[PDB]
Amino acid sequence: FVNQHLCGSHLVEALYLVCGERGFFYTP
């Protein structure tokens, strides 16, 4: 579960950047 936790942390930062003004929902 740790491997996925680490990945998810990086996913949300990339989403923050790519989505910009649009924002996003993160559903693990």
The answer to whether 11 and 26 have CB atoms below 8 angstroms apart is: yes
Ranges within 1-28 binding other proteins (CB under 8 A) = 1-5, 7-8, 11, 14-15, 17-20, 22-28
- The option from other proteins, its own copies, ligand CRS, none interacting with 4 (CB < 5 to 8 A, set by class) reads other proteins
What are the residues whose beta carbons fall under 8 Å from the beta carbon of 11, sequence distance 6 or more? 26
- Residue 6: count of CB within 10 angstroms of its CB: 10
**Shortest CB 10 distance to other proteins, Å:** 9
- Positions touching ligand CRS (CB under 6 A) are 2, 5, 7, 10-11, 14, 17-18
